[PDB]
Amino acid sequence: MPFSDFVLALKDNPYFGAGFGLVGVGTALAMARKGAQLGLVAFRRHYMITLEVPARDRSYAWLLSWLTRHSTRTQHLSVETSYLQHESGRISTKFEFIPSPGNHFIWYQGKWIRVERNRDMQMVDLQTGTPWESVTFTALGTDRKVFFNILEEARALAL
Amino acid sequence: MPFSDFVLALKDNPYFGAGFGLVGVGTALAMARKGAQLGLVAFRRHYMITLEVPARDRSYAWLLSWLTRHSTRTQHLSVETSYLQHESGRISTKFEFIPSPGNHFIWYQGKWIRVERNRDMQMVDLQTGTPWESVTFTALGTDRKVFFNILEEARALAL
């Protein structure tokens, strides 16, 4: 068995040395990527504020209405048509517009808040028969009073 | 341990240098691709207008009917057969045509609008038993009045 033969040959093989160096560089890059992901996670945890509102909760519609009332100039929008045919066939229709799925940026108080109405692409909620949706408000800072004020304003507008 | 030996050898190995250069080029290309995606997202957010109408909302059928009434020369189409057998067996049938799933381009007012009737390939809506469908109107500009006018025209035609 050429155990020592390969060891000595590998020490003087430029190809093997280059391959080992490239493998080490790739491992270092993977470790750096993992460390960057961990650092971003820690930054989000310790210097950012988030509020997640699922579709089941009634604050979803209130927050969407508050958003469309506040940011009047929202280029991307989704429609909600209220259609009801009462007795004697009197059709009543009205178009209500809400922010479209995706990422939206709003300016409340003195902070930039990132609104993300995400519709999970997979499930169908049995209680509604519709895809699972949620809205997430993200902002920089450590004070949660802004989200509480937004929720209170949305509730007041809804009521 | 040959720690310094590999460092000195790697500095004078053409293969290792070429591999490191190729790795750097690949990383730069990946970063450029990510930056291009982010730039396209920002361009869509800040210079384009979108309106998303799900299948559950009743504006879906109204908008499809308005589209097939407006763009009479739509080469790609889908059929909707209304079949009803009243008492005494009087069969009434009528063929209604709507734009087929995919991307359609229409010309409203003085703007080019990209209509996309997409049928999500995955779910089955429990409320209808049919795949989840939605129509998205996309156009260049920052004025949302065009979509409002289209929706009003569709509602007027439907009523």
Residue numbers in the entry:
A (entry chain B), B (entry chain C): 1 to 159
The authors write:
The quality of the density for the bound ADP was further enhanced in the map with applied C7 symmetry in the final refinement and reconstruction. To obtain the best resolution for the TM region of mBcs1L structures, we performed 3D reconstructions in C7 symmetry for the two ATP-bound maps (ATP state-1 and ATP state-2) and the ADP-bound map. These averaged maps reached higher resolution and allowed more structural features to be visualized in both ADP- and ATP-bound states. In the ADP state, the first 11 residues at the N-terminus (residues M1 to K11) form a 3-turn short helix, which lies parallel to the surface of MIM and is connected by a short loop to the 50 Å long, 9-turn TM helix (residues P14 to Y47) that spans the MIM (left). This N-terminal assembly consisting of the 3-turn short helix, the connecting loop, and the beginning (14PYF16) of the long TM helix makes contacts with their counterparts of neighboring subunits to form a seal on the IMS side of the membrane, hereafter referring to as IMS-Seal (left). The IMS-Seal in the ADP state features a narrow opening of ~9 Å in diameter, which is constructed by the side chains of Y15 pointing up and towards the center. In the apo/ADP states, the membrane basket in MIM is separated from the matrix cavity by the Matrix-seal that is parallel to the membrane plane. This seal is formed by the β-sheet I, protruding towards the center, with the central seal loops tightly packed together (bottom). In the apo/ADP conformation, both IMS-seal and Matrix-seal are closed.
